[PDB]
A and B are shown apart, each in its own frame.
Chain A
Amino acid sequence: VHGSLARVGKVRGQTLKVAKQEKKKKRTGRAKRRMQYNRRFVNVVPTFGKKKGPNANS
């Protein structure tokens, strides 16, 4: 351990800092509901019955 126990703010002060990697604008209003409809219903690829969620990483 470095310095004392019961020291406030430790982990937020240790953590290495990284800048935002985004650039492009997102859609708003009607145009976002249009995009969500086309992605969820219109053209879709089938799977085995253990069906897969929208954010599957591995």
Chain B
Amino acid sequence: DTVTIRTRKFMTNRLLQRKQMVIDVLHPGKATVPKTEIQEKLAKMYKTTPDVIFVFGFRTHFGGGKTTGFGMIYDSLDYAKKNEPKHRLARHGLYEKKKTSRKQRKERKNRMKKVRGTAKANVGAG
């Protein structure tokens, strides 16, 4: 297919166990390219697995055909799980967000302040 990828202003980053670059994608006559197709093509460039590759921030220019985004490749998955922000791990199943509302957390705190000693009845089911 015509879909083609290039990499710009690259750097190795030994302080965060990664290498990082700007990514340019050419795709004339098509919609924006999925990030799953971008990361398997980068894996074929750098001769790694696609499992340690993270890409984000893609935006498409007026009149189409070209887009630009940002990406990073980690030395191993245990460095990636320490150094990445938790929302980018959750984009593909490596982290799970807690399911309480902010108001539930606020009002449970303000009920605990009205009791002293072994307060748990206002916490486990209150």
| A/B contact in complex, CB under 8 angstroms | no
Interface residues of A (CB under 8 A from B): none
Interface residues of B (CB under 8 A from A): none
